[PDB]
Design a protein around this ligand. Structure first.
Ligand code: HFT
Lengths: 242, 7
C-alpha cells in the first residue's frame, strides 16, 4: 500500500551465487571457503541494499558503517531462511542455488548445531505463515537491532529511524495483536543464531591458516575487528521481549 | 578501515 512497501521490494537484492564446485566431494575446507566467499558477496549486497533504505542517510557515516557490520550476519541468516523456506519448503538450507546444504553438507561443514537452528527458523516462516511483505519489513528492522552498550555517534536519529521501522511493521499488520508478539518473538530468535555463527567464524578465522580455509579481504577484517566486540559484550542486540 | 574506504 504505501510508498514504504514499494521501496523494500524495489531495493530487494537478487540471486547471488557462491561459485561452488558441486562436482568434487564435500571437504570442510572446500565447503567453508565457499561460504566465506558467499559471505563476501552478500555483504557487498547488504551494503548497496542498506544505502538505499529509507531514512538511512539520516545517520552519521560511521553509524551507517557500524550498524551494517554488526548486523550483516543477522540479516544473512534471515533471508537465507526465507530462501530455504520459499524454494525447498525448509527441507534443506538454501544459501545459494549452487550451495544448498543437505544434512551431509550440514555435518561436514561442521556447523550442524547452528545449521539445525537455522533450519528451525526456515520452518517458522511456514508455521507462522509469513507474508512476503512481512518478511521484507522484518528484514529492514534487523539492521537496527544491534548497537554498542556505549552507543552510536548520533543516537537520537537511530532511535527515531528505528521507531518508524517498528511502526511500519505494525502498520503492515494492522487478535492481530498476537501477530506482533509472534513476529517480535521470531526476530528475537535470530540473535542467538547470529551469535553462534559469530563464534564459529571467529574460531574458524583464528585456526584458518592452520586448516586451509580462504578468508576474503572484507571477511578477515570484519570478523577480527567488529565481531569480537559483540562476543565481548561491548555490542548487544536489542531484544523485544526479556 | 578498508571498509571505511570503499563505503
Ligand atoms: C563467515 C561464514 C563462513 O562465511 C558464513 O557464515 N557465511 C555465510 C554465507 C552466506 C550465508 N547466507 O546467507 O546464504 C550465511 C548464513 F547467513 F546463511 F549463515 C553465512
Amino acid at each position: 500500500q504505501p510508498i514504504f512497501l514499494n521501496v523494500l521490494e524495489a531495493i530487494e537484492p537478487g540471486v547471488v551465487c557462491a561459485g561452488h564446485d558441486n562436482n568434487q566431494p564435500d571437504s570442510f575446507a572446500a565447503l567453508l571457503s565457499s561460504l566465506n566467499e558467499l559471505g563476501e558477496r552478500q555483504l557487498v549486497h547488504v551494503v548497496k541494499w542498506a544505502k538505499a533504505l529509507p531514512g538511512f542517510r539520516n545517520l552519521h557515516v560511521d553509524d551507517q558503517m557500524a550498524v551494517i557490520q554488526y548486523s550483516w550476519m543477522g540479516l544473512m541468516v534471515f533471508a537465507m531462511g526465507w530462501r530455504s523456506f520459499t524454494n525447498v519448503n525448509s527441507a534443506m538450507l538454501y544459501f545459494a542455488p549452487d550451495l544448498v546444504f543437505n544434512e551431509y553438507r550440514m555435518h561436514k561443514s561442521r556447523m550442524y548445531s547452528q545449521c539445525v537452528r537455522m533450519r528451525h527458523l526456515s520452518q517458522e516462516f511456514g508455521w507462522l505463515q509469513i507474508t512476503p511483505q512481512e518478511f521484507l519489513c522484518m528484514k529492514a528492522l534487523l539492521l537496527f537491532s544491534i548497537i554498542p552498550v556505549d552507543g552510536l555517534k548520533n543516537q537520537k536519529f537511530f532511535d527515531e529511524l528505528r521507531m518508524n521501522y517498528i511502526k511500519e511493521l505494525d502498520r503492515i499488520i494492522a487478535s492481530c495483536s498476537r501477530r506482533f508478539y509472534q513476529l517480535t518473538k521470531l526476530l528475537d530468535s535470530v540473535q542467538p543464531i547470529a551469535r553462534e555463527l559469530h563464534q564459529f567464524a571467529f574460531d574458524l578465522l583464528i585456526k584458518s591458516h592452520m586448516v586451509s580455509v580462504d578468508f576474503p579481504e572484507m571477511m578477515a577484517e570484519i570478523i577480527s575487528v567488529q565481531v569480537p566486540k559483540i562476543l565481548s559484550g561491548k555490542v548487544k542486540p536489542i531484544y523485544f521481549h526479556t | 578501515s578498508s571498509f571505511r574506504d570503499w563505503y
